[PDB]
Amino acid sequence: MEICPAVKRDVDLFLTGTPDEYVEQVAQYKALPVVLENARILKNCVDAKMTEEDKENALSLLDKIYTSPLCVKMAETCPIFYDVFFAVANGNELLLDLSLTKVNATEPERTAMKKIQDCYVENGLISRVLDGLVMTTISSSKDCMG
């Protein structure tokens, strides 16, 4: 089934919002100081590491995910998104690659997504409380559960 719009919004802001716009949006779901602190580290990293072209390619890849049969035609909410998102957040390069292949990622798209994964990995955020909590919280919100 299609992704919850609140989830798509969170990823869009993550990529295209200002740091404040993103972190404040996170704070609406989970206002733990550590979560907000980690969210800002991550967001500052993606802004610095990704060019405009990189962001454009991330967005086109995400559009491929949201429109994939492996997202839409499945019984539950957009399963391939969650596979990709959690591979990114926890630095699983193997599963990320496999999952990007399932949605016909271009090389520039793959490069863009790997930069986001690098921001989790290089800042030591794999074993930190962040997007497992935030993404679970958005996805299970009353907004999404309709």
Report if residue 131 touches Ca ion, rule: CB under 5 A: yes
For residue 53, which of 95, 107, 131 has the smallest C-alpha distance?
107
* CB hemisphere CA count around 49 (13 angstroms): 21
> 37-96: which residues touch Ca ion (CB under 5 A)?
90
With CB under 5 to 8 Å by kind, the binding choice for 19 among Ca ion, a copy of itself, none is none
Report if residue 86 touches a copy of itself, rule: CB under 8 A: yes
CA distance 55 to 53: 5
Report if residue 109 touches Ca ion, rule: CB under 5 A: no
With CB under 5 to 8 Å by kind, the binding choice for 133 among Ca ion, a copy of itself, none is a copy of itself
Residue 36: strand, helix, or coil: helix
Report if residue 13 touches a copy of itself, rule: CB under 8 A: no
Beta strands of the chain (E only): which ranges? none
Q: Whose Cβ is closer to a copy of itself: residue 57's or residue 65's?
A: 65
